[PDB]
Amino acid sequence: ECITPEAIFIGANKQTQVSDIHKVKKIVAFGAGKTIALWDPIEPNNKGVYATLKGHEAEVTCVRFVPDSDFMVSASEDHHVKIWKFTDYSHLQCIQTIQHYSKTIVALSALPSLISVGCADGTISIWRQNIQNDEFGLAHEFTIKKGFFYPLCLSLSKVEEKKYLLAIGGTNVNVFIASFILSDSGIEKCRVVAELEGHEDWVKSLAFRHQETPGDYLLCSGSQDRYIRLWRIRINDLISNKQYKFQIDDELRVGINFEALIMGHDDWISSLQWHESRLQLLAATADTSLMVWEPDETSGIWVCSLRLGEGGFWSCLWFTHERMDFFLTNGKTGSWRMWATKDNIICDQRLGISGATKDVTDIAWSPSGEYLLATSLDQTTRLFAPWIYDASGRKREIATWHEFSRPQIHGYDMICVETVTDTRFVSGGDEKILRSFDLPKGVAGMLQKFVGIQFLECPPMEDQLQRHLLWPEVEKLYGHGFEITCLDISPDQKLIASACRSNNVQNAVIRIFSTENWLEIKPALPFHSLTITRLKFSKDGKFLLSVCRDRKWALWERNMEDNTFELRFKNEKPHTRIIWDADWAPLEFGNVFVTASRDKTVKVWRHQKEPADDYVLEASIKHTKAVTAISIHDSMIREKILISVGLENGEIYLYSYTLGKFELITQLNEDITPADKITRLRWSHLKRNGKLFLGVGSSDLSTRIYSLAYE
């Protein structure tokens, strides 16, 4: 019936220009994979990322809000620049795609009706939007003819009406200042006027400050030489030592001069944010330092008034709310850290957002269905759960989801996870090893307090997730040099089934381990196939389903006394292409399993004793793209079964299936689905708040939660 995007967990890209914040709305927009994630940093219920803007075909690199407007500019490694416009108070849509560039866009800077673009081929362009429509047209572009120079940062400043400055920093030790004038349908008098020198390495961040005092404002530059330089700009009323004068025209005379030097002892300068209207400077560095610099009240020299954090920080943001001011910054794990201060004196850390930075490979709910696990190539296993209760046992108005634990942070290329119990899980990958972990005492009391799972003031901070909420490894299992591809637990939680793929010599094999003694049950299952893509124990544990890349499926009958297996059913032409995923249906529906294949079809297989004893094809359904994930809900909804279907391009479908007929409940709106391959779909056993819950992992970089309302 009704579908809600409950939660989106996606990590922030690691570039210095990826993030920005709307001055009026306080909405944080940052590049996250191919998408632009939107975060309300001060939502009353602590909601994290609530939407991801799709469109770019490669990693988003720059994001900037057009000041005093409803527009937003973004850039990507796809060489494109996109113009977005607000449709409601919180969401935007793409209105223009600039395909003028051949290499990655590196820097952006925006002012009302103006955009400054920097490309990795050396091009610097000025775009101003037409007045009739909202389309942005190329006004003029040029190049700094200094070898293979290309810009790494840009900053615009409106000096007077129709007259602008453009700061350029990149692969050069000098800050280039250009000046142009606004004219009918473009610009003129655009040339480089000054080369502010002083830095000793590449300039990585630039930012002009606004004119609180008419005609006298500041420009801060950050370099890879660990320093920040402050430059004073004046107009008409100007005067070692140096000062770079130039004329924007026969009636405007600018004078720039060095004013202050800061830091120099905390690695590269990652990001610099001025604050409106106070005269303070926020700086993020590459050694995980976030500092506020302001001129002393007595001596006037610049001095650090606040220090936060300690790796590295890439971007930082700054907004004021309720007489306090908030500091944002993203780290190596793609997580946003946040602080709040009455004043530069006191502060406390506020709840942030988190997510993977590389493709999400697998997910798995706990047997109870109260939390979700997800692994990523970013070498982390992450646990997400809803914040249902406050500290007093009262139920929160909205149960927003958060990462409550990071069981693993140093896992080499995991591609599969599965929960043994509510307190233990197993994980594997190309390590050629299978690791199992227990739920520690700390995480326990936290899930019990805020999530209600029975067995501080708010969910964890990034500090606690990186080195306190790790699960202790309890068991090492060796595949004897064979890479793992997937696994499953028997319903009784007494058996592991590990799928190991072929080394192009020996074929695939299924290894069975006991959860009690963690010893292999030695009759290993061989194959005439190379890569098993998914194993699944039947609901009653009687059979072990198998699907392979070479288009086959095979059912292994279980001996309930010896815990051994014997091939009983097989099919060598059930599908035309790779079978990516399979899942059983509730026994109350029958003896049924479903397959999903690269051949774009989902097929249902029901057991029949009639001639012959075998699982035969019952129904099929074709799609537009390859089907990569499928999940049947543990319970039955409206006397039928509920099937979620994930495609290679990110689309998700929800079906109700009865004997011989599929029924499209709905295709999830294109604005809430992932932007790439769904790697796993998993319903949650739990029914809560009259809602079913669906967990999704994708090459998006994201782990997403959806709800479905039935009764």
Author numbering: 3 to 241, 255 to 325, 339 to 483, 533 to 788
What sentences appear in the manuscript?
The highly conserved eukaryotic Elongator complex performs specific chemical modifications on wobble base uridines of tRNAs, which are essential for proteome stability and homeostasis. The complex is formed by six individual subunits (Elp1‐6) that are all equally important for its tRNA modification activity. Here, we report the structures of the fully assembled yeast Elongator and the Elp123 sub‐complex solved by an integrative structure determination approach showing that two copies of the Elp1, Elp2, and Elp3 subunits form a two‐lobed scaffold, which binds Elp456 asymmetrically. The eukaryotic Elongator complex has been associated with a plethora of cellular activities 8, 9, 10, but nowadays, it is widely accepted that the main cellular function of the Elongator complex is the formation of 5‐methoxycarbonylmethyl‐uridine (mcm5U), 5‐methoxycarbonylmethyl‐2‐thio‐uridine (mcm5s2U), and 5‐carbamoylmethyl‐uridine (ncm5U) in the wobble base position of 11 eukaryotic tRNAs 10.
A difference map between the full Elp123 model and the asymmetric model rendered, apart from a minor difference in the bottom part, a bean‐shaped density. Our group also independently solved the yeast Elp2 structure at 2.8 Å resolution (Appendix Table S1 and Fig EV4F), which is highly similar (r.m.s.d. = 1.19 Å686Cα) to the previously published Elp2 structure 30. In summary, the presented 3D models allow us to position the CTD of Elp1 within the arch and the Elp2 within the wings, though the precise orientation of Elp2 is still unclear. The orientation of Elp2 in the wing of the map is restrained by crosslinks from the N‐terminal WD40 domain of Elp2 to Elp1‐CTD and the N‐terminus of Elp3. Elp2 is located peripherally attached to Elp1‐CTD and Elp3. In detail, the active site of Elp3 is located in the conserved cavity formed by Elp3, the N‐terminal WD40 domain of Elp2, and the α‐solenoid domain of Elp1‐CTD. The region of Elp2 contributing to the cavity includes residues 201–204, which were found to be important for tRNA modification activity of Elongator. Finally, to understand the contribution of individual conserved surface residues in Elp2, we mutated residues in the previously identified 30 basic region (R626, R628, R654, R675), which was described to be important for histone acetylation and microtubule binding. Although we show that mutating the residues of this patch (R626, R628, R654, R675) affects Elongator's activity, it is not involved in protein–protein interactions within the Elp123 sub‐complex. None of the tested mutations affects the stability of Elp2 and we therefore believe that these regions are involved in protein–protein interactions.
